[PDB]
């Protein structure tokens, strides 16, 4: 049993959010689908629910903008949210629940969520290398990284060596400055002995501005 989520997550203000989910691979009798959202770094907010019979309950603070429907032919649920603004930016989850067995035990499954970002503007990051030097070495290892400066909106993803290097990578949570722009850094520990021969590249992807940047981090000598 698995839940799959679909739908566009980069929107402009006043547009209409439109998401859909489906669940795979058991029989079901009756069931309930729920939509729940989580703004970045905040708590959970319930959107509404719908059963296999199509009866819906909605959060009245969204009510008048929100609609939830089912297609019971394929275990599909859909969410539409109209007239979106920045306060609707959030990860949107669909959750599927039913009762099974002689004891009518509740089984409950969440999709992994769709990040929805409502912005009218875009500014890509500038990526700068954080060079390993004597100043970032400890006993055979050296820390290096990339500074990802002054982008908007969230989020950026950082990988290393096109995802081949994962162990020990610390990609910090972005900071929102009073200037209105975000910055983060990403760091990783490598052997000093590879610094001459192994090349290290951060892969910074900023989907909201549709920009991907590769920055090679070369070593420094003091």
């Amino acid at each position: 049993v698995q839940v799959q989520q679909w739908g566009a997550g980069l929107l402009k203000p006043s547009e209409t959010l439109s998401l859909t989910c489906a669940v795979y691979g058991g029989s079901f009798s009756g069931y309930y689908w729920s939509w729940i959202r989580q703004p970045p770094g905040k708590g959970l907010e319930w959107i509404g629910e719908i059963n296999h019979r199509g009866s819906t309950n909605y959060n009245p603070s969204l009510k008048s903008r929100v609609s939830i429907s089912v297609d019971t032919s394929k275990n599909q649920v859909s969410l539409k949210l109209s007239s979106v603004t920045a306060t609707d930016t959030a990860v949107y989850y669909c959750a599927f629940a039913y009762l099974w067995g002689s004891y009518r035990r509740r089984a409950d499954y969440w999709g992994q969520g769709t990040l929805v970002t409502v912005v009218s503007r875009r500014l890509p990051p500038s990526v700068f290398p954080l060079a390993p030097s004597s100043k970032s070495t400890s006993g055979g290892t050296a820390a290096l990284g990339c500074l990802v400066k002054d982008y908007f909106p969230e989020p950026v993803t950082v990988s290393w060596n096109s995802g081949a290097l994962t162990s020990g990578v610390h990609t910090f949570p972005a900071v929102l400055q009073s200037s209105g722009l975000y910055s983060l850094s990403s760091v990783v520990t490598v052997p000093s002995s590879s610094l001459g021969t192994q090349t290290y590249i951060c892969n910074v992807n900023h989907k909201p501005s549709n920009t991907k940047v590769d920055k090679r981090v070369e070593p420094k000598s003091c």
Binding site: N59, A143, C222
Partner: protein, 216 residues
């Protein structure tokens, strides 16, 4: 409006210990109370529904009890995978609506670990751009609490630095912290010595990592 208050806000314990989390409602919600677990970057997961029932596939070490206004979630013997944020959720009104508590964060308590302090002078590319950022890195420490002060030519800074901390590492249960001091190229060229000074519970003296502008 019905308000759920969770306590304690934060909690550090080791595997094998028992934890009991509290959720208190502003008014009675009968048995309409659910508990959720959420790990970093993961969807919430239902644990307990209708105050005391275990969801399918949820281990026997999770239990809930309570009614009316006072509810608890108990993990009898904590496993490493049980450290996470736990949310309570209540149902009320007609038509029914749901509300969530603000959450209890339960982290792993390990032995104290001092941070390794590293400093990064601004890149050659960044200095040509017109600003200079100096990054101070505190790697793999515990507990979470740490202090970083910036001193440039023996005078300390304020309002020009930003701090960021990772979540608890899933493998050694440590944290790391970044502090970034940002100046204009003009201000950066006014001074020579840039010092990151660090205090932590795991250190016996404040640790400084330093460089001089232009010498690296």
């Amino acid at each position: 409006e019905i308000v759920l208050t969770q306590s304690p806000a934060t909690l550090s314990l080791s595997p094998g210990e028992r934890a009991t989390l509290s959720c208190r409602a502003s008014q009675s919600v009968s048995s309409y109370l659910a508990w959720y677990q959420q790990k970093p970057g993961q969807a919430p997961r239902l644990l307990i529904y209708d105050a005391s029932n275990r969801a399918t596939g949820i281990p026997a070490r999770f239990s809930g009890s309570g009614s009316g206004t006072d509810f608890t979630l108990t993990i009898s013997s904590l496993e490493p995978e049980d450290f996470a944020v736990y949310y309570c959720q209540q149902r009320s009104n007609w038509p029914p609506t749901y509300t969530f508590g603000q959450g209890t964060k339960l982290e792993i308590k390990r032995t104290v670990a001092a941070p390794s302090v590293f400093i990064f002078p601004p890149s050659d590319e960044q200095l040509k751009s017109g600003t200079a950022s100096v990054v101070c890195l505190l790697n793999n420490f515990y507990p979470r609490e740490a202090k970083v002060q910036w001193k440039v030519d023996n005078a300390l800074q304020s309002g020009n630095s930003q701090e960021s901390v990772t979540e608890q590492d899933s493998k050694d249960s440590t944290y790391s912290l970044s502090s970034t001091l940002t100046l204009s190229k003009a201000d950066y060229e006014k001074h020579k010595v840039y010092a990151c000074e660090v205090t932590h519970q795991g250190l016996s003296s404040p640790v400084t990592k330093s460089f001089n502008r232009g010498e690296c």
